[PDB]
Amino acid sequence: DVMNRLILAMDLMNRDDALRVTGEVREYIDTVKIGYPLVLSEGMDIIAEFRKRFGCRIIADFKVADIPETNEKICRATFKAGADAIIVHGFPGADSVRACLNVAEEMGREVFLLTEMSHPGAEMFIQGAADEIARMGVDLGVKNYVGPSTRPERLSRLREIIGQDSFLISPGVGAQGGDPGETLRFADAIIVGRSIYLADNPAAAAAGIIESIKDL
Amino acid sequence: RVDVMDVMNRLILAMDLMNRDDALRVTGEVREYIDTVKIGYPLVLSEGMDIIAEFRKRFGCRIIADFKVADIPETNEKICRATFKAGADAIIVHGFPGADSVRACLNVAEEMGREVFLLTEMSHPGAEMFIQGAADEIARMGVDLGVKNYVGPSTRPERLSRLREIIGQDSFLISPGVGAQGGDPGETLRFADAIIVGRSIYLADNPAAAAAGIIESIKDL
Ligand SMILES: O=C1CCN([C@@H]2O[C@H](COP(=O)(O)O)[C@@H](O)[C@H]2O)C(=O)N1
Ligand SMILES: O=C1CCN([C@@H]2O[C@H](COP(=O)(O)O)[C@@H](O)[C@H]2O)C(=O)N1
Numbered sequence: 001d002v003m004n005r006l007i008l009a010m011d012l013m014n015r016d017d018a019l020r021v022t023g024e025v026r027e028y029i030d031t032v033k034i035g036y037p038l039v040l041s042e043g044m045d046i047i048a049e050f051r052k053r054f055g056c057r058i059i060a061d062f063k064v065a066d067i068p069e070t071n072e073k074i075c076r077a078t079f080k081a082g083a084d085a086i087i088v089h090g091f092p093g094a095d096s097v098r099a100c101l102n103v104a105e106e107m108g109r110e111v112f113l114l115t116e117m118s119h120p121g122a123e124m125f126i127q128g129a130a131d132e133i134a135r136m137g138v139d140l141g142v143k144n145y146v147g148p149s150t151r152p153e154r155l156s157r158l159r160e161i162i163g164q165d166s167f168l169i170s171p172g173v174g175a176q177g178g179d180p181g182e183t184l185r186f187a188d189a190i191i192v193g194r195s196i197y198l199a200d201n202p203a204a205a206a207a208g209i210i211e212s213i214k215d216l
Numbered sequence: 217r218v219d220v221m222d223v224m225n226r227l228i229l230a231m232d233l234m235n236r237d238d239a240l241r242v243t244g245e246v247r248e249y250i251d252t253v254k255i256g257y258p259l260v261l262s263e264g265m266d267i268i269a270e271f272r273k274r275f276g277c278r279i280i281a282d283f284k285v286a287d288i289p290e291t292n293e294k295i296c297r298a299t300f301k302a303g304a305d306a307i308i309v310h311g312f313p314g315a316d317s318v319r320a321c322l323n324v325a326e327e328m329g330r331e332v333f334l335l336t337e338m339s340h341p342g343a344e345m346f347i348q349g350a351a352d353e354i355a356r357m358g359v360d361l362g363v364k365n366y367v368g369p370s371t372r373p374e375r376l377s378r379l380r381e382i383i384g385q386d387s388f389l390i391s392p393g394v395g396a397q398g399g400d401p402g403e404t405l406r407f408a409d410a411i412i413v414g415r416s417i418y419l420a421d422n423p424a425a426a427a428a429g430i431i432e433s434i435k436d437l
Contacts, residue, residue, distance in 0.1 A: 011291065011294065013294060013298065035287075035291065036283075036287075036291075036294075036295050036298070037291060037294040037295060037298065039261075040260075040265055040295065040298040040299070040302070041265075041298050043264050043265075044261055044262075044264070062257075063286050063287060065284050065286045065310055066256075066257075066284060067338065067339065067340040067342075067397075068340060068342070069396075070232065070256065070257075070258060073232065073234060073257075073258035074257050074258060074261065077234070077257075077258065077261040077262050078261065081261070089286055089310075091312050091346050091347060092338060092340070092342055092343065092346075092347065093338075093340065093341070093342020093343055093344070093345040093346065093347070094342050094345060095340060095341055095342035096340060096342045097342075117288065117313060118288065119288040119289060119313075119314070119316060119317065120314070120316055121289070121313055121314020121315050121316035121317045121318075122313065122314055123314070124314040124315060124353075124357070125311075125312050125313075125314065125346075125350045125353070125354070126312065126313065126314070129346045129350075132345075132346070133346065136345070176288075
């Protein structure tokens, strides 16, 4: 359940800068996506400090993409550190995804499957496998997916493959060129980074996104 | 080649033990046999990125951060910069996300005077689903991008042979999957400049013995 269907992609690599901008929009968002830029620079503990400070949900955007054995250790360390869910790459195959799924089940946490990416290079290899990956996710029982806001038509095919009962979130809104509303037509929530945290006033920017989405 | 950074004994230790003391102890025990250590997320996420500078100072070993960077260009650059800032000598990047994603890593590597290793084909079974079908092209893309260091699968020597003929004799190839995953040090080293070995060594009763034994079976070839 994402407040305002808006998730913040906190990719500032500065703890102060990060905590500060995440406080300037906490009233608008209650779900934060934390990735390696911040975790590698400030440590895995930044996750508990984010929870303690903002009492927000944490999605670790780690794009796990290793062999099953290692994917298990990465997920375990990520959940131990307190992440509510972790985003996993599907291109490595079914056994690699099933590894994070097992650890998510064992620790009562969630796995989000990244099927298609939002950037241009994504066309070379990812795009053509996107559907088979989303399908693999269905066979595996994955209920949470991540799809490209930059390609509304693709984001739409993804939603018809995963079904209406699946939770779908989508990055690539704003900076990369995606439109909130058009994205929210198929996705449950949008992920927005630079458009908020690189803004003179993140509080406003965020608000502005919600104001053009209340009409939804 | 010779215009590349070699690895002592063609053996790279994959240190994936998840706690500082055991990692430091096991690595110290085999330090005599290797001079390149591959540190991944299992260790870094449990003990912090400072662990990279500590291994580097303590052992005088070169560090390869096996982070498999696989994000968009903008984020890949921040990940590589943080990794190099942490002191790593190289970083392993996935190729499946495309050329623009690899170039972002390469820009920061050459900017900071570090290396990038491109992961073309993976070594687990699931790697046959979508990565194997794109591997030759990912390798071709890396050669075109200027990539000189690659990572290929020990578990599939015929596939590793194809990689080597795609990247040529001057490129540097390292390969995982030897031991716990079933790969043999011999066949692999016919194509790869060096093997990456984790569990066969760090979970052995006696790590030093395990490492010396491998280096021996390699010695004759
Ligand atoms: O397909 C993907 C992979 C995940 N992401 C992640 O979503 C976030 C987007 O931030 P921006 O809104 O500034 O583009 C960023 O953390 C990025 O790494 C993608 O943008 N696209
Ligand atoms: O294709 C790949 C990706 C990198 N790796 C990495 O190589 C290391 C192998 O350790 P083992 O030797 O115990 O299998 C481990 O850290 C693993 O994550 C692969 O094994 N295969």
